[PDB]
Amino acid sequence: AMLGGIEAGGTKFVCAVGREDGTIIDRIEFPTKMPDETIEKVIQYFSQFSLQAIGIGSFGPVDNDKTSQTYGTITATPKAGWRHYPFLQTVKNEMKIPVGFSTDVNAAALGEFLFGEAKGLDSCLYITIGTGIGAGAIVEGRLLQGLSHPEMGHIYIRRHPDDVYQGKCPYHGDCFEGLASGPAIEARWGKKAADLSDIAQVWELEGYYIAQALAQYILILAPKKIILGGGVMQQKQVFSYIYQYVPKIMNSYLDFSELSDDISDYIVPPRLGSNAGIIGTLVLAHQALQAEAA
C-alpha cells in the first residue's frame, strides 16, 4: 500500500515514498531547475517503487480548482519555466496513477491535522515562514479553497515605527512576507538569519510582525490551533515574543484561554518538525486514491 509525495519548492524538490499513516519509507531531494528535467528526475526516482498514488504540494500561487482547465499548474512565479507548466498533468501522464495536488502549506496543514498538533480538532492553520510566507487552513476537516487557495503571506500588516526597511516583496513591497520572510530579515539586517541568532532586536521585530499577522487570522478565521513552521521559526525565541504581542494587539476583545493564559498551547511549532509538508503530500496521495475508488 505505498504512496508517493513531491514537495515542490523553489530551491529544491523533495520526493518521498511512504504509507497513509504518515511513515516515510524513503526520500530523495534535488535542486529545482527547469521543469522538464526536474520532473524527469521525479519520475526516475518513483520508477523504483510500486506506487498506488502520488500527492504534489507545490509552491504557488497555483490553480487548485479541480474544475479549471489550468488545474494543477503554478499560475504565478518569477522562476524560469514554471508558470503554466502542466505539472499535475505531466505527472499523471507518466505515472498513470491518481495524483492529488495542493499548495505546499496546505500539505503541511494536512500533515499536522492528521498526525500532529491538530490531530483530534476540526480546524487548524499552518503557517510557514521561510523564503516566503504562506498558510493553509482546515475548516470543518477540509482544506480551505475559495476563489483561490489563500495567500495569507501578502496581507499588509502595520509597520513598526522604528523599521525603515522598504520590504522584499516584488508585488507589494511591505506586505507581511515582504517584512518578515527569511530574505527580508537578511536584506534588512545585512547578515543571514541563522547568524542573527543573538541579536534580540531582530527577533522582537520578527515576532511583532508575526503577532500582527496572527491577530488578523484569528479575527478572520479563528482557527482552533495555529502551527508555525519554516526556516525562520527554527529561532524558537520568536515564539516568546509572539506570545507577548498577540494579547496586547487583541486587547482582550475575544475571551478565550487560547488567546491569553494558554496561548503557548495555541500557537505552537509543528509536531512533525520539518516534515509536515512531505508527510502531508502522502495524505494528498491517499485522498486522490480514495477519490478514484469512489
Ligand X SMILES: OC[C@H]1O[C@](O)(CO)[C@@H](O)[C@@H]1O
Binding residue per annotation — 244? no
Nearest CB to ligand X, comparing residues 82 and 266: 82
Binding residue per annotation — 99? no
Sign of CA dihedral 221, 222, 226, 230: positive
For residues 88 and 206, what is the distance between their CA atoms, to the nearest angstrom? 35
270 touches ligand X (CB under 6 A): no
Interface residue list for Zn ion (CB under 5 A): 154, 169, 171-172, 175
Burial class of residue 111, CB neighbours in 10 A (0-12, 13-18, 19+): buried
For residues 175 and 170, what is the distance between their CA atoms, to the nearest angstrom? 10
Least spacing, CB of residue 79 vs ligand X, in Å: 10
For residues 103 and 21, what is the distance between their CA atoms, to the nearest angstrom? 20
Among 197, 216, 260, 274, binds a second copy (CB under 8 A): 216
List the single partner that 103 binds among ligand ADP, ligand X, a second copy, none, CB under 5 to 8 Å by kind.
ligand X
3-state secondary structure 193-210: HHHCCCCHHHHHHHHHHH
Binding residue per annotation — 75? no
Nearest CB to ligand ADP, comparing residues 64 and 235: 235
For residues 39 and 93, what is the distance between their CA atoms, to the nearest angstrom? 12
Interaction site with a second copy (CB under 8 A): 61, 75-76, 123, 139-140, 142, 144-152, 154-158, 171-172, 212, 215-224, 249, 251-256, 258
Query: Where is the binding site for ATP, in residues?
Result: 131, 183, 231-235
Interaction site with ligand X (CB under 6 A): 59-61, 103-105, 128, 132-134, 153, 177
